[PDB]
Amino acid sequence: KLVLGGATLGVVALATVAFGMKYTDQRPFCTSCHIMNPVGVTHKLSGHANISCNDCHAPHNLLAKLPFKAIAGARDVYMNTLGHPGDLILAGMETKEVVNANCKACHTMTNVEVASMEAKKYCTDCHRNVQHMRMKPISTREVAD
Amino acid sequence: KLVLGGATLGVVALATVAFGMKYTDQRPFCTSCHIMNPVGVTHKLSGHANISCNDCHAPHNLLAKLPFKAIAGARDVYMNTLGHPGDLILAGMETKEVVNANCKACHTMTNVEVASMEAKKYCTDCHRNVQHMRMKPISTREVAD
Amino acid sequence: GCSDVSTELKTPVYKTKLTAEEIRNSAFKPEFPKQYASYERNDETTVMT
Amino acid sequence: AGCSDVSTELKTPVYKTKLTAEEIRNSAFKPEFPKQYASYERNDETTVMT
Ligand code: HEC
Ligand code: HEC
Ligand code: HEC
Ligand code: HEC
Ligand code: HEC
Ligand code: HEC
Ligand SMILES: CCCCCCCCCCCCO[C@@H]1O[C@H](CO)[C@@H](O[C@H]2O[C@H](CO)[C@@H](O)[C@H](O)[C@H]2O)[C@H](O)[C@H]1O
Numbered sequence: 001k002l003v004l005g006g007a008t009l010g011v012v013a014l015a016t017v018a019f020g021m022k023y024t025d026q027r028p029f030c031t032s033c034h035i036m037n038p039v040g041v042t043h044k045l046s047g048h049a050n051i052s053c054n055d056c057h058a059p060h061n062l063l064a065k066l067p068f069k070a071i072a073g074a075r076d077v078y079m080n081t082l083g084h085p086g087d088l089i090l091a092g093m094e095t096k097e098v099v100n101a102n103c104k105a106c107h108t109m110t111n112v113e114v115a116s117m118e119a120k121k122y123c124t125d126c127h128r129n130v131q132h133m134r135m136k137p138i139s140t141r142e143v144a145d
Numbered sequence: 146k147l148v149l150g151g152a153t154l155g156v157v158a159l160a161t162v163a164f165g166m167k168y169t170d171q172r173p174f175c176t177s178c179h180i181m182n183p184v185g186v187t188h189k190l191s192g193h194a195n196i197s198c199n200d201c202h203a204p205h206n207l208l209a210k211l212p213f214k215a216i217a218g219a220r221d222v223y224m225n226t227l228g229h230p231g232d233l234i235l236a237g238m239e240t241k242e243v244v245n246a247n248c249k250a251c252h253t254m255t256n257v258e259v260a261s262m263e264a265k266k267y268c269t270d271c272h273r274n275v276q277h278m279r280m281k282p283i284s285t286r287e288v289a290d
Numbered sequence: 291g292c293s294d295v296s297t298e299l300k301t302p303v304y305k306t307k308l309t310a311e312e313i314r315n316s317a318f319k320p321e322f323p324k325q326y327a328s329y330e331r332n333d334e335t336t337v338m339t
Numbered sequence: 340a341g342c343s344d345v346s347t348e349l350k351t352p353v354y355k356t357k358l359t360a361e362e363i364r365n366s367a368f369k370p371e372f373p374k375q376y377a378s379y380e381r382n383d384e385t386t387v388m389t
Contacts, residue, residue: 006151007158014156022291044297047254052294109192169340177341185345205293253299260301288351 024069025054033080035089038141042132056102057095068098096122103130169214170199178225180234183286187277201247202240213243241267248275 023029030053031040043049048056058072059065072095079085091099103123104111116123124131133141168174175198176185188194193201203217204210217240224230236244248268249256261268269276278286306321319326356371369376 003147003151003154006148006153007155009148010152010155011159013152014159019291026292026294027296049254049297050251050295055294106195109194173344174341176345182345186347186349189345189347249299250293250295253295253297256299257297258302262299263301285349288349290352 021066021069022052024073025052025058027053033076034145035080035085039132042141046130046133048130056099059098060102060105100124166211166214167197169218170197170203172198178221179290180225180230184277187286191275191278193275200251201244204243205247205250245269248272 027040027043030036043053054065054069058068100122104117107123111117120126129135172185172188176182188198199210199214203213245267249262252268256262265271274280308317308321312318315329354371358367358371365379
């Protein structure tokens with residue numbers, strides 16, 4: 001009953017860690033910064049509204065995901081406080097690769113007997129609006145502030 | 146130091162229960178009984194090949210899922226050992242209702258503007274072959290034991 | 291953890307700005323432009339099977 | 340409790356009998372295939388109408 005105190009503080013420590021990793025994948029957290037609002041609005045309006053942000057945006061492999069979350073998170077907290085973001089927020093080369101590998105993780109079966117990885121670099125070179133509905137008028141995605 | 150040894154039991158006893166719960170959600174575990182491999186073949190051949198069996202067959206909610214998996218596992222083990230299954234293996238009301246709720250969990254956004262839950266009792270009344278390709282010739286699904 | 295199923299499937303419920311006796315098709319077009327666009331396809335009168 | 344994935348090739352069960360190349364007697368198949376044979380013997384029922 002004194003080593004069974006560790007086996008509670010231990011299961012509550014891991015269950016807290018686990019909840020926190022999942023919470024921090026999610027649209028409410030991602031959009032707690034007003035800069036992420038337009039991407040949050042287009043997510044919620046789309047076919048993919050019911051999967052989290054990191055279902056596309058971070059690796060699914062656990063050993064790859066934790067470090068990716070920390071580094072991306074660190075860049076973002078920085079650019080939101082001490083940096084000066086441009087007028088254009090565009091994904092870098094690394095997120096393009098992790099987003100695209102996730103398309104395939106979930107939609108292999110539609111594509112199994114076709115060379116759809118070979119003509120266009122990315123899936124979204126054909127499925128353009130899976131990229132946050134980027135072809136729709138500006139007022140359907142964006143307000144000032 | 147008998148707390149740092151009891152907290153290492155709790156984070157290995159939850160990491161084992163967590164891994165063991167996901168393992169027994171999956172196709173190699175389910176089809177370990179040969180009575181289950183027509184459903185296994187048809188799962189692997191389908192658009193849902195890369196989601197687990199229990200992504201459809203059990204509640205996603207963790208308080209609901211644990212009891213369900215145990216009760217379902219108990220009766221399936223009994224039927225495979227001391228029971229006598231018939232020539233027809235069919236799902237009960239219980240599993241028709243959990244499978245159907247899971248259709249809605251992953252496919253809400255397709256269906257949001259339409260009364261698709263109202264005419265047909267189940268999603269699979271229209272999406273018939275999601276029910277293990279049941280309309281295809283027997284030889285594409287089945288062999289002698 | 292949590293679900294990101296933040297949007298729940300619900301049978302659609304409507305309350306229009308129309309009177310109980312409205313029968314003009316054009317009166318529905320503002321409320322329901324998607325189904326109205328579909329309905330206009332019936333104007334196609336060129337195609338045989 | 341179980342480990343490898345299902346195969347999708349649906350390999351039919353394979354047999355090697357003690358029968359010669361040109362065996363045609365029905366009773367010669369009974370010893371090795373009693374389930375299929377007993378099912379075959381159900382064709383004797385000649386009373387039932389639809
Ligand atoms: C949850 C609300 C989010 C948040 C906060 C973001 N996303 Fe996405 N995203 C997807 C794709 C294909 C792209 C383009 C990548 C590429 O160039 O190949 C993006 C891009 C972004 C950006 C910046 C770029 C932009 O176009 O605005 C940002 C800020 C962003 N994401 C955040 C695809 C997806 C998804 C897969 C279907 C999902 C889910 C999300 N995004 C969700 C979110
Ligand atoms: C939740 C887990 C997420 C996800 C998936 C993303 N964000 Fe943000 N982010 C913030 C700022 C100020 C920028 C612009 C930086 C710049 O102009 O250089 C971004 C950028 C992105 C991108 C595009 C850049 C890239 O990495 O390719 C993407 C895909 C993205 N984010 C996804 C600010 C914040 C936050 C404030 C602290 C928070 C919280 C998030 N973002 C959350 C998320
Ligand atoms: C309940 C039994 C259902 C029903 C009726 C449908 N789904 Fe799903 N589904 C999921 C994903 C990621 C895909 C795309 C897979 C890919 O592109 O490779 C699908 C696909 C479909 C389809 C199209 C394919 C087909 O077999 O006809 C249809 C009609 C369909 N679904 C309906 C994801 C999920 C789930 C997430 C865990 C769940 C649960 C379901 N699907 C369940 C159902
Ligand atoms: C990477 C950016 C992609 C791309 C190009 C696509 N997906 Fe997904 N997707 C998933 C599920 C469950 C659905 C069905 C939702 C529903 O039925 O309501 C979809 C839907 C699509 C579509 C059709 C809808 C559309 O917006 O055009 C398309 C073209 C599509 N996807 C391509 C599941 C997932 C994922 C699992 C977590 C991931 C990752 C992705 N999708 C990512 C992508
Ligand atoms: C969702 C897309 C499913 C996945 C993934 C798997 N199954 Fe399935 N199963 C699904 C439906 C819609 C049904 C019919 C339910 C109904 O309303 O009648 C079933 C049924 C079964 C059955 C027996 C009944 C039958 O029709 O064959 C079994 C034994 C079964 N399911 C098991 C099973 C296994 C082992 C799976 C993984 C390989 C699996 N299912 C995946 C939908 C879905
Ligand atoms: C052997 C011990 C089994 C394992 C492991 C799994 N299943 Fe099974 N299941 C088994 C038998 C012998 C039967 C037929 C019994 C009968 O009722 O005739 C079944 C039945 C099902 C069903 C249909 C009945 C129902 O519960 O709705 C389903 C949907 C089903 N099985 C699914 C399923 C899943 C998801 C499994 C993995 C977790 C799984 N089964 C494993 C034997 C065995
Ligand atoms: C300290 C006590 C520890 C005991 C554990 C009990 C406390 C926590 C239990 C929370 C109960 C809800 O359990 C939670 O339900 C939702 C479904 O609604 C699941 O959510 C799952 O399915 C939905 C779709 O159906 C997906 O959007 C999501 O990505 C997926 O993870 C969570 O994976 C599960 O963890």
